[PDB]
Write a protein that binds this ligand. Sequence first.
Ligand code: L2W
Length: 127
Amino acid sequence: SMNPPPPETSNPNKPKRQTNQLQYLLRVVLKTLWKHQFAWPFQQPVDAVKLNLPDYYKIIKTPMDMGTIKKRLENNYYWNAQECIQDFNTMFTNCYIYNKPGDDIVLMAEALEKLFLQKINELPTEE
Ligand SMILES: COc1ccc(S(=O)(=O)N2CCCCC2)cc1NC(=O)c1[nH]c(C)c2c1CCCCC2=O
């Protein structure tokens, strides 16, 4: 019935780098989704205690949210752009696992995912 700890946003043992693709993911992809009309349900981990959703973390074992992704990018947690893209896709996948067609949260996820795909399809080349 408790929330899990949020996903780690730094691993002090991992090497760190900046790349044009990671810059794109933070400054173009995440930033565009973050200011979207439908961003607010996805800006932080699902708080299953405050929202009284005790089955959420019984169903969702790989939680992910844009707040975690944003912190991961700002902390240089990701070495490969693919790692971050996987996290965005996990976030959307979780929403479709837990919810149903026609749900408000699903219509919001679909709109955000459409925008995510438009931006990720312009990911710059590997410098
Ligand atoms: C009724 O839902 C809410 C009511 C109020 C607020 S809040 O922004 O006022 N605030 C959030 C931070 C803590 C204080 C309250 C947010 C929500 N929900 C969500 O954020 C959310 N986000 C997701 C991904 C999902 C959900 C819930 C629907 C099913 C599971 C799911 O998939």
